[PDB]
Amino acid sequence: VNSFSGYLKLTDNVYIKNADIVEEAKKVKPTVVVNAANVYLKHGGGVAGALNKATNNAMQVESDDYIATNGPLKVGGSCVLSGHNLAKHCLHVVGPNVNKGEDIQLLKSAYENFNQHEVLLAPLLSAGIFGADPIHSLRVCVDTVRTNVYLAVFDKNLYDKLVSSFL
Ligand SMILES: Nc1nc2ccc(Cl)cc2s1
């Protein structure tokens, strides 16, 4: 049993809810929250800007030190950093950004990072301002992640479309 409430069960391991991931993280304090990161860990907008704002910019300060030491992530890659006031850990995952011309085949590689964690609170990778089709992102998630993933979908309209169209 875990603390996640109000989710619709899609599969054995994937759950979905219309929720603000920031407000969900603040309520649950999950072991892992996933950030929709870019390779520079520049948390300007979308999910990353919202998560970082909720940490009072402490996520960005930590991230800048990580990049200064290690250099940029790979598209499809990840790193584990602090979850600050939102979670124990933040798994920063880089899905491909369609609005930069990145290979959508890298979305499966991105979701494979989730398999290193038994339970996660996450957004749909490459959705929103990363430009991918969220229906596609949900299909790749279900077909790739084997650990228990609780997806927070920001748009009520999109949430209802993802559920209604789910095979
Ligand atoms: N407080 C939140 N801000 C955002 C911004 C973009 C997306 Cl895709 C989800 C969320 S939840």
From Swiss-Prot:
Residues 1-167 form the Macro domain. It is found in: Host endoplasmic reticulum membrane. It is a multi-pass membrane protein. Inhibited in vitro by GRL-0617. May form homohexamers. Interacts with N protein. Responsible for the cleavages located at the N-terminus of the replicase polyprotein. Participates together with nsp4 in the assembly of virally-induced cytoplasmic double-membrane vesicles necessary for viral replication. Antagonizes innate immune induction of type I interferon by blocking the phosphorylation, dimerization and subsequent nuclear translocation of host IRF3. Also prevents host NF-kappa-B signaling. In addition, PL-PRO possesses a deubiquitinating/deISGylating activity and processes both 'Lys-48'- and 'Lys-63'-linked polyubiquitin chains from cellular substrates. This is Papain-like protease nsp3. It comes from Severe acute respiratory syndrome coronavirus 2 (2019-nCoV). The lineage of its organism: Viruses, Riboviria, Orthornavirae, Pisuviricota, Pisoniviricetes.
